[model samples]
Target chain A: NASKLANTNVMVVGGAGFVGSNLVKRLLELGVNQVHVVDNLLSAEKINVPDHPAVRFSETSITDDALLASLQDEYDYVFHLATYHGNQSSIHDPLADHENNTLTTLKLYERLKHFKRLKKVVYSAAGEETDIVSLHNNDSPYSMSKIFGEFYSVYYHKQHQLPTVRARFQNVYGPGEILGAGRWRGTPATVWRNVTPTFIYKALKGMPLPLENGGVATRDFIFVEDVANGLIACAADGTPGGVYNIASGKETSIADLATKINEITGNNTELDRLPKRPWDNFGSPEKARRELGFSADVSIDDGLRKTIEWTKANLAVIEQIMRKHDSALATY
Target chain B: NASKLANTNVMVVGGAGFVGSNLVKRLLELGVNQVHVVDNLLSAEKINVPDHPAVRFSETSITDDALLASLQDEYDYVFHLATYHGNQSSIHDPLADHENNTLTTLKLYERLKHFKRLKKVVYSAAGEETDIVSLHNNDSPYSMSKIFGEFYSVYYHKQHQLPTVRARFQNVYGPGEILGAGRWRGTPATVWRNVTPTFIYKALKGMPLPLENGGVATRDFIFVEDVANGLIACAADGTPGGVYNIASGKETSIADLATKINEITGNNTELDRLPKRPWDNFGSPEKARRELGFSADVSIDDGLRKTIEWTKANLAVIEQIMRKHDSALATY
Candidate 1:
């Protein structure tokens, strides 16, 4: 069934970032004939590019029309995963977030509008779209930007008649998620901070993991590999203009996740409780299962263990990234 | 009762256009001490500026930081009415639409964020926000930009606690609206085209008016002066983070409007039937009445008679403008 994508030419818009890098590796393993990546190196680096003859990487923003024109009409499928990446960075400077997230996505679609060989366009939408209640109550700039991106995706599909599918993802944790950053700098001069990475970093150093709002906030913790696989499935056979939730279909409280990280790292530090973010909530992935035949396969325990091992293996690099920014590796 | 804005220092962001110009005149009539206007004149002109000593006009985009900073801590109220207007214009070049509408509004808010003397920031939102069904079905870039603008307004009020109000306006028709003319060039190389102005122009020239979908599309056609009055009411006493519909509270079919125009102009031209636009829909102004104690005072007959008389009086200027843009003036 997966042989549909074999021998196809593909392009990944943000293929150098965490999810994107893993996606590129998966595409190559699926026997894709040629996989081209276009990234601006804003939050990702050249090191994330796998050394394979089938992979061709370009370090340019999608807004660069001249470079993008070179790949025009050449791709069978395109994956859009590049964005400003996190919530806090956007809060610091929303204008930059808008430029990076909304404008760039529009430009990418414009470039690919006339591609004769294009089969499908899979957009990595934020899981917040499903959390309409939270979106109404909370006014996060990141959420607004992602909503704008999704709206643009819908526009391209409806008006231009492009074959586009949106993949709304929950919190994903796995091997390539870097903590304290290494070659990953974002808009606000801070390393990306997700619950899993922060917990892994703190547990490794025997520090209290900060749990905002009494750690009651719940999330669907899908593994990065599973999300990548879901995206591939969407690109291959998703309904045009459909929005699918690529999530774990199960909720895990932040407190429970922290306890699991501590258990894995053999640390007993208590949680540093703090106030919660405005839009934090639980989301469902029932739509992905029913529609795309995709559901997160990795259990939380398994995903957390794999992430902890990867963090431990990349300790020196992570510490260097933290110290270079004059930040304590243990504190987020 | 309307003297609440007396002695207040006000700024109108797009004060030289149809709605903004009318709003500016109302503020002056309300005895405001100073009314500063900031506009790039992209869709307006110096002729639209009122002859008042208290009015100081700046021909600058809201994205200009230094000029905006100078007025930052001075104004008591700011009315933001500037945008790349019209639905079809935005579809031609969506990136430009995003820059002009969404990004510029965000930048303006950023500049006004630290204003110590600012009482309220009132935004001119499109009526499309009220048509949930149409919005779900259609993906007009113009509507999307306006929605993003409203979301940003909510974010500013919620996150920074800025006193922001959204005025969702229906189809506003009155004297200052330019059609098929100079000084109103928009995307798609056509001047602003709406039902009232286009019908008025065609009726004046003994030309057949195009009525799409048998002219059954309905809209809440608020008079321009009434919309200005509603906005003033909102700026003075609106709730923080509130969205108020500034409309006529009545629906008028396009056929009805066209017949009214023909009746007023004494023209017997037949109707040119066409298909309706995808996003066209009927909107309600019940929320404006319930919340702001505001509704259109001018009826369709009264509004049409006034517009026809104004068109007759300004025939020379209108003809000159049409002659300047000869190709589009006829085709559009």
Candidate 2:
């Protein structure tokens, strides 16, 4: 983290969000000179990150032409972590979803073309967003838009010789991974929340965690902090036009996750589950590990414990956003 | 062409363009009740197209939200032949290209959801634009956007239950195919023109046909009329979310194409070519043939002969557009 990135001027898009927050802190810890944070603060209304003397937050949307005009043409690295979040929200407004995910990335690449000193653009993608696998099982517009956005990155790299690396994030859950700040795209913000944090938040509230259809649904959960490191690793050495999976290469069932969270929180709760989550399986980190020296150093248990602690610390803030349906957090 | 299409209220987006012009005529010939042509008339200003009493030309851009809101919602079949044109133009203006190709298809699908009588959306994709082949060999933004647009159609079909079929068009060249009407995206619109029409136009001009890199580049060239019927077949019975290749299933090298056009045009000119066109190969028509009873009856010679005659007939019109740079025909 310190060798190449040290004293590097980097741009972190959506740096105030959960995963972005982790990456920005990590970048500073790596001794970066300037961290330009570009975010519309759209989703930052949900849950957010810290301030540092080195970090600069641009409140402009990436879709704005003004952003392209005002951007400094000398970034060493760019971590594009912005997204419109989950399934139901995308289904509700696919046009907005496309604007956020695909169109935003396309516009950023257009601006990135001017970055003469740019090292690499690390484009964040969802887990198992395979070319055909997900195309066949496109149950959500979120997944589809991510794939579309990734195609643009591939295009930018292949066509314009832009240094672009794709980082496919598996199920990420950890400290600062928002609870009722509404990561879920299901019917209600509280209903159909992401597995790990949902379980932890429900455990804290002593609510029943209904394990759907005997909890057959499986996913690979990587801690948000580890995901940050993996993302940085992707930027550091990931081959241009290459796709690297920043994941735990291991799938854990819903029952196991719910049980782990319950035990960690000292809450015995039943799991609620039923699930077309075809792309929810584990992503092989072989490419990332072999090429970028990426390793998920934080074990699931430690990650879960760390998340539970952080959730408890941020419990009041979490509860406040959850109390009302009209909360900006609930709107996705 | 006659059975299912007869009396059908069809909408052909960009119906006045080369391929769309043929499709609209064929649809009428098949006894369609109405052929609603939804072209921006942007490209129509390039290559001239005929008008019929039944063909209602809506000179509105597909990107216009008003077009979506004001649509009849009675189309039984939609032949989405609209595109931002070719590689150079797409690279020149990707945002507009995206708006035309991907967004247009997406918004149309959105409007199609309200159409109670809508049967199918026959999306026109370039030949051999495979899930991964064109992605790897994405020399042109045209290919990338087509793939992206095809992806959105698949999404609409899978997620929203829209009956969308993808028709991968081979190198379609025939009667109404424009030459100097600025189809090429190369340095000059006249320079990197599409192979078939370029050869025919140049042969008629008695210019040397430069064949690139040994003229090894092979492509499946299907006649415009055959493509028109294939598009209709896709609408008639193509399975929802299925990809069908509306092609000749035969790879014709550049030398073969140039020579064929030269002989047909009564000008035995030398071939001119230099070519990463990795996606330039034959497409398998087995799927379309098996499923939709598709047949490419016209041979290269016959197609070239027909195209040559049409070019001779419209030679004055073709030369008229080539006279100036700012000619609406010269602009893509």
Candidate 3:
């Protein structure tokens, strides 16, 4: 039987991103009355905030001592999900990635050493900690920093006797996501709208999607809701200092995902197969199933339907976002 | 078959320190034409460099980018032995230790990733890497940094394919070493010499020493010469990106060591018992034996004899250093 909900003082470190936003919503649903969110809003734009009365937001980084220390004095749990750009972005600028990801965690860890009331910390560590070279493309700064983050956390726990747990997230996706939003809303969006929206859209347009490393490299496309659920379960009951993989536990090729999207929209199309990048990984999420009561409820077909429905409703706003940062989106 | 050493460009990162100096001596002895040593000489005041044609010294830190990059490009095999402090000091000031040791290695690893001609890097890592918390008391900066160093190195090797190997050293003791040099060397030496010697001189005063700790909490006291030989062996033939234990594969406890010292020096002092520190360990060298062909030719008895003879000859110089430093040598 699921235990009664504790009146937990939970601090969601990155409470504005896709998974975090969904997690905040779920935590509120789970009767978590006092969920304080501290986010630098690095990735999440201003438009992303829900402005909900249930959530109290502090626009701050985790490294802020006054903020963290004050929160450390009150909070029972901490979920550290503050990480920089994905693998491609980290390679373009590792120094920046180290500063934002590794150094920030180091600062928080330094402060947490003295946090007495703190019960546990849940870290969204990269699976790269075990097989980093294969997952994060041995050269990816972001992956390296993520692995370094886990080690740093372990050091803090070992030294200060702080209880901590780590979760390695696979490719998380869900309804609120905007994967092709930039491309769809920018000049490309305008160009496609002018030319053929029926041909270019990911779902119905039967467009050619370019994938790195040919379409052979596979990934576990976990819905963001499932990820949020896993985080909350792990936060409440996960073993201290344990590492678990939070994933869909299923492999989906780039070709298969594109095909599913096309089928949902009744647009038959072949994806543009490109060379695979080095940071690709076929993950194992068995650890998640064993540790947390993690079982994916959203299938790719169903998830795509929800995503497409949401996209259709939010098309106008997303089109504007894409138009404003089409070139900038490529940088991400 | 062992490789030839005609024109090997060997760069010893911490060549001014005890082990580094010994390694440098062995490198010279091995007929290596050019040996460049890089160190800041932070604690090595008495470590004067003599006029040696084969040795070239650079008072530069390994973390210095331009200097390390320039020097690294010149060397074929690198012996990275630049660590901040001994095991005891590391548990005291971990922040400083991490800055000096861990961050330094990370910086060097980054540079090594770009260096093209580098054949192998021989890292002198700590025995604490296996289980630091068990061996250490407070997880001081030294242990933390050493642990950080291990992870960073592994990350580099795994990610960038940088050729590196680590040597985990045990209680290495040899000649040219100031015995118990760090803590109260002068006052203790003076009390043990003038007053205690007088009392012993008056009595038959000399008895066979008593056993303490029942000669347990064993140590593998490989000689400095033997350690130097082991490093050279590892540098030449040890597998790349591997960790090897440089130990004598035997345990010699305090009581056993005292007996061996008395047998050699013929000193008739009664046994003394002191509480053991937390960071002490009895390590296994089986891995070293299996991989690097590492073994100590110096027996416990013979090694004690060698150390005792060297101490006797250098007692005055040792006393001078101790007295000059106010009896307490600065801990790194």
Per-residue alpha-carbon lDDT of model 2 for A1-332, expressed as tens digits? 23589999999887877798889888888999999988875555424655668888787778899777888777999999988766767887787777877788888898887567988899998873244433466676778778776778788887777899989886888876664453333346333347787778878989888677768777888889889889888888988888888988777788788878889898965555545367654577787777777788788889999999998998888776656454444564
Which pairs clash inside model 1?
A213-A274
lDDT of 3 by residue, B1-332 (tens): 03444478788877776678778877776778778887776534335443578788888777676885574476677888877655444444444455567667876777777677777788887762242222123245566566556656665677677787777775666664543332332223322222112222222225555454544455566777778877877787777767777777776666566656665666666666555566555557677666666676777767666666666666666656546554344432
State each candidate's chain A TM-score: 0.89, 0.90, 0.82
DockQ of each: 0.36, 0.37, 0.08
Quality of model 3 by C-alpha lDDT = 0.63
Residue range A46-144, candidate 1, lDDT tens digits = 668887799988888887878867765878999999887667777767777777787778888877777779889999987733423222544567787
**Each model's TM-score?**
0.91, 0.91, 0.74
Best by lDDT: 1
DockQ-wise, the better of 1 and 3 is: 1
The sequence of per-residue lDDT tens digits that candidate 1 reaches over residues B280-310 is 5544667666666776779989998988898
Against the native chain B, each candidate's TM-score is 0.90, 0.89, 0.79
How much does each candidate deviate at the interface, measured as C-alpha RMSD after superposition?
4.2, 3.0, 7.4
lDDT of 2 at A4: 84
lDDT of 3 by residue, A153-209 (tens): 666677777677787886776655543321222223222221112222445434455
RMSD of each: 3.9, 3.9, 7.7
Error of 3 at A175 (Å): 4.5
Candidates 2 and 3, the one with greater DockQ: 2
Can you give the lDDT of residue B89 in candidate 1? 70
